[PDB]
Coordinates of C-alpha atoms in Angstrom, one line a residue:
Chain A
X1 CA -4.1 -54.8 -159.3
X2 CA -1.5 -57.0 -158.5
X3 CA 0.9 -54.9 -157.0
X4 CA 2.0 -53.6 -153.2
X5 CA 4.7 -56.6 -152.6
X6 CA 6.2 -54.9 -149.7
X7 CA 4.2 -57.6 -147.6
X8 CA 5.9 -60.1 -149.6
X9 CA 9.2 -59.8 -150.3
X10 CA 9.7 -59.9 -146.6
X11 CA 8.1 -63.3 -146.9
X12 CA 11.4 -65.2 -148.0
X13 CA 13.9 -63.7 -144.9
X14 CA 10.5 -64.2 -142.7
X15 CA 10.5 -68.1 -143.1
X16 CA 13.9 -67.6 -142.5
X17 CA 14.4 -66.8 -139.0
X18 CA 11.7 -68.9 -137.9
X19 CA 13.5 -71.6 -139.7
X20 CA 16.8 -71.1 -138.0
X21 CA 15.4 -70.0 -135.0
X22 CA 14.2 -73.3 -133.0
X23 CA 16.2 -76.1 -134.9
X24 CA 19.5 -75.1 -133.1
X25 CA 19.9 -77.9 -131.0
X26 CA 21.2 -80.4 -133.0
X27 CA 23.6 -77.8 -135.1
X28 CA 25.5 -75.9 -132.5
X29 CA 26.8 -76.6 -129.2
X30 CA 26.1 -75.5 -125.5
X31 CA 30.0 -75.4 -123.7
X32 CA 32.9 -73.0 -123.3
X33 CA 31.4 -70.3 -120.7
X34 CA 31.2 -66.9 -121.8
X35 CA 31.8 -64.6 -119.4
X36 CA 28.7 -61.9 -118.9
X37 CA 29.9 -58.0 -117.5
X38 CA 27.1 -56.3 -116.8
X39 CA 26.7 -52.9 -115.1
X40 CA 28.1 -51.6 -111.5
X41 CA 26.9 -49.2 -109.4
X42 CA 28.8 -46.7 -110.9
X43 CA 26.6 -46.7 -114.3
X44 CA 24.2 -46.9 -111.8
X45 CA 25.0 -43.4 -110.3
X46 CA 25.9 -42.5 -114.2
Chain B
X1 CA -0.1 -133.7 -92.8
X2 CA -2.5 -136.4 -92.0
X3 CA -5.1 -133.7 -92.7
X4 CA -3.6 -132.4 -95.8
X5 CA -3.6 -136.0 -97.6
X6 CA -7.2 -135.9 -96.7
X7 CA -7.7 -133.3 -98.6
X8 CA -5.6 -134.1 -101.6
X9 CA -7.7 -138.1 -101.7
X10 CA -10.9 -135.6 -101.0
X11 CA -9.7 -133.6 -104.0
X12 CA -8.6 -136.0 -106.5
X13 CA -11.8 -138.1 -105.8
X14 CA -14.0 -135.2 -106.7
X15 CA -11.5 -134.7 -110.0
X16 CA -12.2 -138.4 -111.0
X17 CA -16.4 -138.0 -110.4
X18 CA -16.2 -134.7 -112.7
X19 CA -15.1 -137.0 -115.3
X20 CA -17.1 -139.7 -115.4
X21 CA -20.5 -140.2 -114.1
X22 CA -19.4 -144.0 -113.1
Chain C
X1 CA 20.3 -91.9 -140.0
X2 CA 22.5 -89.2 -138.4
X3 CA 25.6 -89.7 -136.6
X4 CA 28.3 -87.1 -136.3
X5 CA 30.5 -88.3 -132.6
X6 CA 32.0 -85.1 -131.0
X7 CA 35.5 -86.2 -130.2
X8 CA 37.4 -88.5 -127.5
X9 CA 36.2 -86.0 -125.0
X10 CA 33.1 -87.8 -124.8
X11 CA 34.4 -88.5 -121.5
X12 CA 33.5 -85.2 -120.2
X13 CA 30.2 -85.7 -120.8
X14 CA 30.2 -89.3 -119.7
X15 CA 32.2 -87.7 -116.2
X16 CA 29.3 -85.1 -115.9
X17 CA 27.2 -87.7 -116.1
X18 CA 28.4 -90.1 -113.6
X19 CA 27.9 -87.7 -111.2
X20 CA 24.7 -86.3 -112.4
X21 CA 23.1 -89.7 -111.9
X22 CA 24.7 -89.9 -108.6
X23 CA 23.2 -87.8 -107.1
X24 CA 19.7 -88.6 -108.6
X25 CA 20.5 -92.2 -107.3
X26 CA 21.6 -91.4 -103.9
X27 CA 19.2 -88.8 -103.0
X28 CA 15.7 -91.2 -103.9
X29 CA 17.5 -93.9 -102.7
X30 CA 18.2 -92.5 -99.2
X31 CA 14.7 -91.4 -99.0
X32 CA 13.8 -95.0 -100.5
X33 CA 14.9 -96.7 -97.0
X34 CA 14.7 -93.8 -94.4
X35 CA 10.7 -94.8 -94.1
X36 CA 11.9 -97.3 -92.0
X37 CA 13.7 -97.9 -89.1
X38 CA 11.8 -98.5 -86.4
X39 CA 9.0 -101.1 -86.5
X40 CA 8.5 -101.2 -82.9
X41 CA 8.4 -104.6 -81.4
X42 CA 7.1 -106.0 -85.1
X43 CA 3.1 -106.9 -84.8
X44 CA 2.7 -108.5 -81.1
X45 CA -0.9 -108.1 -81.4
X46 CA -1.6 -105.7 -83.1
X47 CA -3.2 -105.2 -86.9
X48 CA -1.2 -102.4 -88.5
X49 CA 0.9 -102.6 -91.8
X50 CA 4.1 -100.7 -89.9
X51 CA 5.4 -100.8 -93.3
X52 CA 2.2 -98.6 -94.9
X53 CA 2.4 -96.4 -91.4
X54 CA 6.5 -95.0 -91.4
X55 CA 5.6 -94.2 -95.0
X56 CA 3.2 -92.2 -94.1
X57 CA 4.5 -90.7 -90.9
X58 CA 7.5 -89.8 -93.3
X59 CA 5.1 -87.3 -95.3
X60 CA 4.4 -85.6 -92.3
X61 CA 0.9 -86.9 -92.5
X62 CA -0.2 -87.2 -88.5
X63 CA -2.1 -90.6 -88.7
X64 CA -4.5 -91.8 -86.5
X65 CA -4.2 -95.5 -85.0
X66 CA -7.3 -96.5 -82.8
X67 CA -9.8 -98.9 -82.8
X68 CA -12.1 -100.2 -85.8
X69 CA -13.5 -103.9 -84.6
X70 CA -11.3 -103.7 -81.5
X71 CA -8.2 -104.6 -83.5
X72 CA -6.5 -101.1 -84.8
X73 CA -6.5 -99.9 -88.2
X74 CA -4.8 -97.1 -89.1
X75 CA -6.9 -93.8 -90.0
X76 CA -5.6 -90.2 -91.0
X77 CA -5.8 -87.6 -89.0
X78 CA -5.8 -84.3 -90.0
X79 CA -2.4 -74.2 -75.1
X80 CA -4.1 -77.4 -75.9
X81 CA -7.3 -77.4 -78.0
X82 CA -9.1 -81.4 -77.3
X83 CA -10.3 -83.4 -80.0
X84 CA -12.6 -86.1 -79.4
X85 CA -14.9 -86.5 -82.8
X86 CA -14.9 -88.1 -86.0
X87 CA -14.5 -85.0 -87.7
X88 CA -11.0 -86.0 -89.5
X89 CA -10.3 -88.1 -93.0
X90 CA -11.0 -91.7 -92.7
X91 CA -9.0 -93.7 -95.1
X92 CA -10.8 -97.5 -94.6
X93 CA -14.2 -98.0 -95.6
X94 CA -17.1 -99.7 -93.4
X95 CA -14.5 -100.4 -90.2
X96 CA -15.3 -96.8 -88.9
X97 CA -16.2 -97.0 -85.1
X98 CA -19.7 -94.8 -85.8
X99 CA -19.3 -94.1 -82.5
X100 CA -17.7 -92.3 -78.8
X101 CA -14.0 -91.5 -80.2
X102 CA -11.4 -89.9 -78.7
X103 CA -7.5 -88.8 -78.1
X104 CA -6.3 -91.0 -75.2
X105 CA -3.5 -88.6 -74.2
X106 CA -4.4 -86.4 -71.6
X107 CA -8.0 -87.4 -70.5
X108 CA -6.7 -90.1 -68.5
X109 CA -3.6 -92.5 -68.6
X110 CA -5.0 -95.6 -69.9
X111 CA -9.1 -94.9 -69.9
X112 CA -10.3 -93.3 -73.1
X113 CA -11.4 -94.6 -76.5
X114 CA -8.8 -94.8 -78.8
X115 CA -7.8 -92.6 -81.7
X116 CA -4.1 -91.5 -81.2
X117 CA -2.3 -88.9 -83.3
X118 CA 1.3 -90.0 -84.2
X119 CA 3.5 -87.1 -84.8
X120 CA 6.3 -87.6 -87.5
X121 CA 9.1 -85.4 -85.0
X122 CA 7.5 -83.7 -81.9
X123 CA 8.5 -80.5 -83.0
X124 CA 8.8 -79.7 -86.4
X125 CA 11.1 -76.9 -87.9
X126 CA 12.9 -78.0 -90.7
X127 CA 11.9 -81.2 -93.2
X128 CA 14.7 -83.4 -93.5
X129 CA 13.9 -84.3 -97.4
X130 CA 15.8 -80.8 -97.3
X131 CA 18.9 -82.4 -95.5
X132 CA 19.2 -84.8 -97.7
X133 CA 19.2 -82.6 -100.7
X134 CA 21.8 -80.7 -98.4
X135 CA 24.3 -83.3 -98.5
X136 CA 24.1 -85.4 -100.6
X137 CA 25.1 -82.3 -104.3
X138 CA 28.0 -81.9 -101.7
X139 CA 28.2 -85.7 -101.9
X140 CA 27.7 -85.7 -105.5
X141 CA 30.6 -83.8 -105.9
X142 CA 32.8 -85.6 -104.3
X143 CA 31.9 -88.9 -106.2
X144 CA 32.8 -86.5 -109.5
X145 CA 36.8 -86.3 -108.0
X146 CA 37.2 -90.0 -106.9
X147 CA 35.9 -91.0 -110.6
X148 CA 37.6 -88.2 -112.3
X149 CA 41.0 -89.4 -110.5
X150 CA 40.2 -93.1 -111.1
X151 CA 39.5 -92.4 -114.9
X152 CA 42.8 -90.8 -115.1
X153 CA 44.8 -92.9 -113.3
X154 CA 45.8 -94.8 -116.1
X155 CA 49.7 -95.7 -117.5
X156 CA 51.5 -95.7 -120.7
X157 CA 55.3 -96.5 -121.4
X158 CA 56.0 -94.0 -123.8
X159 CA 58.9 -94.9 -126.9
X160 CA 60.6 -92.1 -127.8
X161 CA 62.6 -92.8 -131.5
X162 CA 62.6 -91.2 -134.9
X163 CA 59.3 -93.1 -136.1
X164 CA 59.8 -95.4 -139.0
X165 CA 60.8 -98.9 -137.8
X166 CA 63.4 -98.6 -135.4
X167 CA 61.9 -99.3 -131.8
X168 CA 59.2 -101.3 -133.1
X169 CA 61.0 -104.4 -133.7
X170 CA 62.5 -103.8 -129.9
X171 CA 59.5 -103.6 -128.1
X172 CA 57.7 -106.8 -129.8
X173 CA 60.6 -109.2 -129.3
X174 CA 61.9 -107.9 -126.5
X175 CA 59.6 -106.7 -123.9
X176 CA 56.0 -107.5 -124.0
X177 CA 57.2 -111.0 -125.1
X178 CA 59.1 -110.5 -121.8
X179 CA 63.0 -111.1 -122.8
X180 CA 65.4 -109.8 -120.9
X181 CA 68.8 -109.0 -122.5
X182 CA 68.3 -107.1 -125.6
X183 CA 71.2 -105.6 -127.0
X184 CA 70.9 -102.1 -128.6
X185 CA 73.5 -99.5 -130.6
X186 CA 75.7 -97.0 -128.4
X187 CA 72.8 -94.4 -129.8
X188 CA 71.6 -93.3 -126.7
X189 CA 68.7 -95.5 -127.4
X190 CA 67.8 -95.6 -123.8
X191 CA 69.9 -93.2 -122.2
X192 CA 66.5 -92.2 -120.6
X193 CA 64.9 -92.0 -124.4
X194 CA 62.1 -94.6 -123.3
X195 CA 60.2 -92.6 -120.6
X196 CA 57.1 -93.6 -118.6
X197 CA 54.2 -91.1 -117.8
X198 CA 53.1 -92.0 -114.4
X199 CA 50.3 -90.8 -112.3
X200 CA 51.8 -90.8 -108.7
X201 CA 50.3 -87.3 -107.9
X202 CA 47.0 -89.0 -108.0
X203 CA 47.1 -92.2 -106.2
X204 CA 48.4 -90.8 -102.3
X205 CA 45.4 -88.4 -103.4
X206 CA 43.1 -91.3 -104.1
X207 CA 42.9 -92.7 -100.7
X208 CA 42.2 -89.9 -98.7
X209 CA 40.0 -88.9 -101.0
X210 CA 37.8 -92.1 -100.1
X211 CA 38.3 -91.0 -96.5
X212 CA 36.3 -87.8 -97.4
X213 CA 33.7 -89.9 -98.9
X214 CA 33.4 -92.1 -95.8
X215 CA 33.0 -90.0 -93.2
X216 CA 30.8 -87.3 -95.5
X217 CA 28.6 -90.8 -95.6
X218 CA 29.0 -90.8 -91.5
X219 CA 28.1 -87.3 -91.2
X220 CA 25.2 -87.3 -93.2
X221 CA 24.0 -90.7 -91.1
X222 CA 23.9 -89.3 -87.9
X223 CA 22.1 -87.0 -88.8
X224 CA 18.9 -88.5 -89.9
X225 CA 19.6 -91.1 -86.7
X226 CA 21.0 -94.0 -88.3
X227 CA 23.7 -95.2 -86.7
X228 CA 26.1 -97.4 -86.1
X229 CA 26.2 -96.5 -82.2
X230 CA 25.6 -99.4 -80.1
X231 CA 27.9 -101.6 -81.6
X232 CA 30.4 -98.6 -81.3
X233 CA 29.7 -98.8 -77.3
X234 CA 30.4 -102.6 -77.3
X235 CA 33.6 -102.2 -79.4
X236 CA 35.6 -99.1 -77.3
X237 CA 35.7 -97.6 -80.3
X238 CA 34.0 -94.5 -78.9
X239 CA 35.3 -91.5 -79.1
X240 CA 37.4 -89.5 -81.8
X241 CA 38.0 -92.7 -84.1
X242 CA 34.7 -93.3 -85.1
X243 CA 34.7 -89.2 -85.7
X244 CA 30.8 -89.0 -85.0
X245 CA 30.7 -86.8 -81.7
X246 CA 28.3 -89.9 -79.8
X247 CA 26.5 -87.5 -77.8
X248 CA 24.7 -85.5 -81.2
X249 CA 24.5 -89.4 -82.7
X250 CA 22.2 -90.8 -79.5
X251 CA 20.6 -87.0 -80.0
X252 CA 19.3 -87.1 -83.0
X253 CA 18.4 -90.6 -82.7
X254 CA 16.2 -90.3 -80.0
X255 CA 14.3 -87.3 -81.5
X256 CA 12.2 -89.7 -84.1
X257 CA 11.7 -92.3 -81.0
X258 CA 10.1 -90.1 -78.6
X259 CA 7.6 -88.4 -81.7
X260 CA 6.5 -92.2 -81.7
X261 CA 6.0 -92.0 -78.3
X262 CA 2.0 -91.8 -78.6
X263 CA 2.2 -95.5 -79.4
X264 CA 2.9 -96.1 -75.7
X265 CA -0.5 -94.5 -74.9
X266 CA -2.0 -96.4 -77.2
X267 CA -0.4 -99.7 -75.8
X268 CA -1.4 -98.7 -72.2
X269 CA -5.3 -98.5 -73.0
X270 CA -5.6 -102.1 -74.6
X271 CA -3.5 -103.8 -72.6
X272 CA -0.3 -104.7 -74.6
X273 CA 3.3 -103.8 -75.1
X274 CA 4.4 -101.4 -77.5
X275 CA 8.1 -99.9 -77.5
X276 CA 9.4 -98.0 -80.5
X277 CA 12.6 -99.7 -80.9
X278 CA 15.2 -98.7 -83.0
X279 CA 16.4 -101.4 -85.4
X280 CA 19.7 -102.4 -86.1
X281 CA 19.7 -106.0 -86.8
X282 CA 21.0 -108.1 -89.8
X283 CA 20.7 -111.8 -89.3
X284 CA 21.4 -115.6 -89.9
X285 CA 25.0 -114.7 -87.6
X286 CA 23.4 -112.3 -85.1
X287 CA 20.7 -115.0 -84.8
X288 CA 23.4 -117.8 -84.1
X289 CA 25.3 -116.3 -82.0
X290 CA 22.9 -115.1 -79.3
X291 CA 21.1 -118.3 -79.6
X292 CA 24.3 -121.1 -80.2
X293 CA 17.8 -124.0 -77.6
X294 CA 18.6 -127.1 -80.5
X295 CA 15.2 -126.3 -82.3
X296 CA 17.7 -123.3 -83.7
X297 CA 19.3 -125.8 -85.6
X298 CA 16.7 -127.8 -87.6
X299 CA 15.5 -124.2 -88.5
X300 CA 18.8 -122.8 -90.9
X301 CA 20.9 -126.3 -91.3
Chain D
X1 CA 38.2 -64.4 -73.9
X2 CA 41.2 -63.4 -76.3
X3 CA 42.3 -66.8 -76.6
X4 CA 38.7 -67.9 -77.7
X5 CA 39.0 -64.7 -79.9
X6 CA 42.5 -66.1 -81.5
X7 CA 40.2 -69.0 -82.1
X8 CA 37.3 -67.7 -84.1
X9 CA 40.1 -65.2 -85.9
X10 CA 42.0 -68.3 -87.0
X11 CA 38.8 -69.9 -88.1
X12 CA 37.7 -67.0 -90.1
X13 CA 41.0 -66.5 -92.1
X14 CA 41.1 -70.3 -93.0
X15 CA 39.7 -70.7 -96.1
X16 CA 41.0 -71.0 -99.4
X17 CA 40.5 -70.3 -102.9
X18 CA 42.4 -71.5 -106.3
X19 CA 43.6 -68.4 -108.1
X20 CA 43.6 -68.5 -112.3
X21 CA 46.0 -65.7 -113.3
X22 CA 46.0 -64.6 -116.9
X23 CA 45.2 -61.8 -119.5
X24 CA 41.7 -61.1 -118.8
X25 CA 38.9 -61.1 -121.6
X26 CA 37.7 -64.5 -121.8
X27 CA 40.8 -66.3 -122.1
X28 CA 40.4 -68.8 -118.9
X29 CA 37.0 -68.4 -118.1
X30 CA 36.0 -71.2 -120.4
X31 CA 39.1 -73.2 -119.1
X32 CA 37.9 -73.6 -116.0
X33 CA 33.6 -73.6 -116.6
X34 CA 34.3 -76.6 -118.6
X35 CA 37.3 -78.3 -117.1
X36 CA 37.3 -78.0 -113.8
X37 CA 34.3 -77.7 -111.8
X38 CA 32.8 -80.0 -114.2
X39 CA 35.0 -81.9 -113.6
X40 CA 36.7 -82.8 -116.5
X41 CA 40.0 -84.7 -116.8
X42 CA 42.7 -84.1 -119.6
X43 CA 41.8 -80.3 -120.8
X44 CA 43.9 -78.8 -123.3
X45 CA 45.7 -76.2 -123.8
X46 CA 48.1 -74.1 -125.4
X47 CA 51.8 -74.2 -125.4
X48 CA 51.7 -70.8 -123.9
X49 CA 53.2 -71.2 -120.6
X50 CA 49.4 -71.6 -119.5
X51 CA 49.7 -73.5 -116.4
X52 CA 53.1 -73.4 -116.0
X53 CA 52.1 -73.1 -112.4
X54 CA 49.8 -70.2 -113.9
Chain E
X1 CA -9.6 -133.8 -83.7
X2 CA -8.3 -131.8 -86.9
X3 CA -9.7 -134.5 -89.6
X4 CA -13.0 -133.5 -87.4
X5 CA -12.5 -129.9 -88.2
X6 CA -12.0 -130.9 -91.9
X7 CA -14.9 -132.8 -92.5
X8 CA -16.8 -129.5 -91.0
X9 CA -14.9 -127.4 -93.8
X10 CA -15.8 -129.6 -96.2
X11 CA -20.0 -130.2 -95.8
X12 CA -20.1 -126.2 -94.9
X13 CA -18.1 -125.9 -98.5
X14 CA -20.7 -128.7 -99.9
X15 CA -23.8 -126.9 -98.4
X16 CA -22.4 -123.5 -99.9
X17 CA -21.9 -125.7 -103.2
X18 CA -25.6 -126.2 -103.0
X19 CA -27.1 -123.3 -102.3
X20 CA -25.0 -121.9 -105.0
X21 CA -26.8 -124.5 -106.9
X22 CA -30.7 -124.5 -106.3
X23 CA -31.8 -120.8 -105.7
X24 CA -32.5 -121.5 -102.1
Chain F
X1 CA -8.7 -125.4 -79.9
X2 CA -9.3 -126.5 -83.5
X3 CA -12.6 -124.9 -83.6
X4 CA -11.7 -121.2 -82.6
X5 CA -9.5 -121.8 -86.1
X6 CA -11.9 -122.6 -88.1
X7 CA -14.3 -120.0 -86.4
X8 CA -12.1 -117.2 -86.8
X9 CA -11.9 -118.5 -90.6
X10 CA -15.5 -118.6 -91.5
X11 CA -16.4 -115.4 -90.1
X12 CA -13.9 -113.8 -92.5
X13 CA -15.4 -115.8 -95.4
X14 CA -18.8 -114.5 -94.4
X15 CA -17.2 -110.8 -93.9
X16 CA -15.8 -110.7 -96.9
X17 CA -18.7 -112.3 -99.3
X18 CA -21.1 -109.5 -97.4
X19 CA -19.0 -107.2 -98.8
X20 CA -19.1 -108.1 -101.8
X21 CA -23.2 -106.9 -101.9
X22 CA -23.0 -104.8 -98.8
X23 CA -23.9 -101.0 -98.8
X24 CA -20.8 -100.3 -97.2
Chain G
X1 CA -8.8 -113.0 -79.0
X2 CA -11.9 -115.4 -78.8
X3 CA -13.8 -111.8 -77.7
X4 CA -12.5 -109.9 -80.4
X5 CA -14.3 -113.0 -82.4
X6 CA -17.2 -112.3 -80.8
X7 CA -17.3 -109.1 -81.9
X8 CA -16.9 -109.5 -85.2
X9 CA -19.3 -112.1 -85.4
X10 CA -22.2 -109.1 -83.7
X11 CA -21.0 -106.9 -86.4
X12 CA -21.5 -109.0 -89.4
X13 CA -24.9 -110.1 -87.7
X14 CA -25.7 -106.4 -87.6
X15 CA -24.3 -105.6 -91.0
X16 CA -26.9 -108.7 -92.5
X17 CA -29.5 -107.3 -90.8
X18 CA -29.1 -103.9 -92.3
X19 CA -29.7 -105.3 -96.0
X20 CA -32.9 -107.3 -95.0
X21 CA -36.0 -107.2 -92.8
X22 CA -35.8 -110.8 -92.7

């Protein structure tokens, strides 16, 4: 039968990531620093 | 330079026999 | 086509990039020229392209000057250990001697066949292709503020009125057509309302910025030897004006002189003079003046 | 010895940073990432007292 | 003297002509 | 004088023609 | 210099008569 479109309804948001996925570059921009916290000793010891 | 306008008659002489077999 | 400009702040891209290039440009070029400095009394006698030879001593590459026909061509040649074969790379093609070669260090003075190894430095620790990538980011930097205060250093007389054709009509007859005496209404209409936007917190830091460049120049030169130094003992200019500390300056010369030395042994088996020299001569005035022999003359004019 | 001390103790204390000052959660950070140590001239910013020698 | 040395170069040159010519 | 030229200037015509066929 | 000629001239002599028996 034709049925079982699980496989295939991911189809149209799986083309879509790798559609916005490598073409960034000349959409968005690379500045304005974000600052990155990540982790001390102490949640080290927790 | 004596030499050297030698060479330039001996040169131009052979340039005028490749020309004509006179 | 596609074309969407980011903004006037363009600029801080073109900034980043001034810099950026900089540094490219000042790091290959200073590795561009440091292959030579020494030529060593330039071809007396002798057939080696000095040229190809501080090239290659600059890789670190020991080479290997002897003899070929009697007339020394260069060869490559990679508690004390004695070599005396053919065993190492040969770079020309039928000149090899096919014969007795040897070091002509320590066997004798002056008496062995010739193959002597050149060493780059005598001893080695550190490559100085990682010197000059020391200074010259701190360099690069440093070019980035005197172009980032020269960009900026740049003046407007601002007008100051409520907008619609008031001032206008003042500034264009009257002062870039260069009038003196106009006459204006008791409105305040320069009781300080004009008002100028000057940069003169940037141009007493302009100069001594320029000083930081020079001497960051200095300090990366005497470094890698090159020097301004003998000229600097026939001046009196010394000491503590020329701030180079004269005594690490002849230092650091001298190191890249005496790894040449093996040169000399080579010069004292064939019977010639060889001196690594240090060069630091620019001419058509040094060559007057130490000459004023009227053959001189129908040479330059 | 302790003068050559008062030497290296002078030395070691010599050095000098540029303090931002301001609320803290990415506020200034990208201020100074792309405006100052690249180099940038004429950064802008708010009218919120934010370098009035900030 | 040199004009000598010249007219050497050039019959060596006119004898290499010639043997580039007829095979030997 | 002249000759020791003109030697020195052959011999690297013939060097560099045997070359040209050598086995080197 | 005129030695170093000489040389040479022994080499390339050597050299032809590597290629050839005659």
């Amino acid at each position: 039968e034709n049925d079982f479109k699980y496989f295939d309804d991911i189809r149209p948001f799986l083309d879509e990531i790798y559609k916005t996925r490598e073409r960034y570059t000349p959409f968005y921009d690379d500045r304005a620093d974000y600052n990155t916290n990540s982790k001390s000793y102490y949640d080290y010891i927790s | 330079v004596v030499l050297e306008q030698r060479i330039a008659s001996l040169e131009q002489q052979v340039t005028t026999f490749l020309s004509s077999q006179m | 086509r596609g074309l969407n400009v980011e903004l006037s702040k363009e600029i801080s891209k073109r900034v980043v990039e001034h810099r950026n290039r900089f540094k490219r440009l000042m790091f290959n070029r200073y590795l561009e020229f440091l292959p030579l400095l020494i030529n060593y009394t330039n071809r007396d006698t002798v057939g080696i392209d000095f040229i190809q030879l501080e090239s290659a001593l600059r890789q670190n590459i020991n080479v290997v000057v002897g003899e070929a026909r009697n007339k020394q061509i260069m060869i490559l040649g990679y508690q004390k250990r004695l070599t005396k074969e053919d065993i190492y790379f040969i770079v020309p093609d039928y000149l090899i001697p096919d014969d007795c070669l040897q070091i002509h260090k320590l066997y004798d003075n002056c008496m062995s066949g010739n193959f002597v190894v050149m060493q780059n430095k005598p001893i080695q620790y550190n490559s100085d292709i990682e010197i000059i990538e020391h200074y010259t980011d701190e360099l690069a930097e440093v070019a980035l503020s005197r172009f980032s205060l020269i960009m900026q250093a740049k003046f407007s007389k601002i007008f100051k009125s409520e907008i619609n054709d008031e001032s206008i009509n003042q500034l264009v007859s009257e002062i870039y057509n260069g009038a003196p005496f106009v006459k204006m209404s008791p409105m305040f209409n320069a009781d300080d309302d004009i008002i100028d936007l000057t940069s003169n917190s940037v141009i007493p830091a302009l100069t001594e910025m320029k000083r930081e460049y020079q001497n960051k120049i200095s300090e990366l030169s005497n470094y890698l030897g090159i020097n301004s130094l003998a000229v600097d003992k026939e001046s009196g200019v010394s000491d503590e004006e020329a701030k180079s500390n004269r005594g690490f300056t002849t230092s650091n010369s001298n190191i890249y002189l005496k790894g040449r030395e093996p040169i000399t042994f080579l010069s004292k088996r064939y019977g010639l003079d060889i001196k690594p020299y240090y060069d630091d001569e620019t001419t058509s005035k040094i060559s007057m003046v130490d000459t004023l022999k009227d053959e001189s003359s129908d040479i330059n004019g």
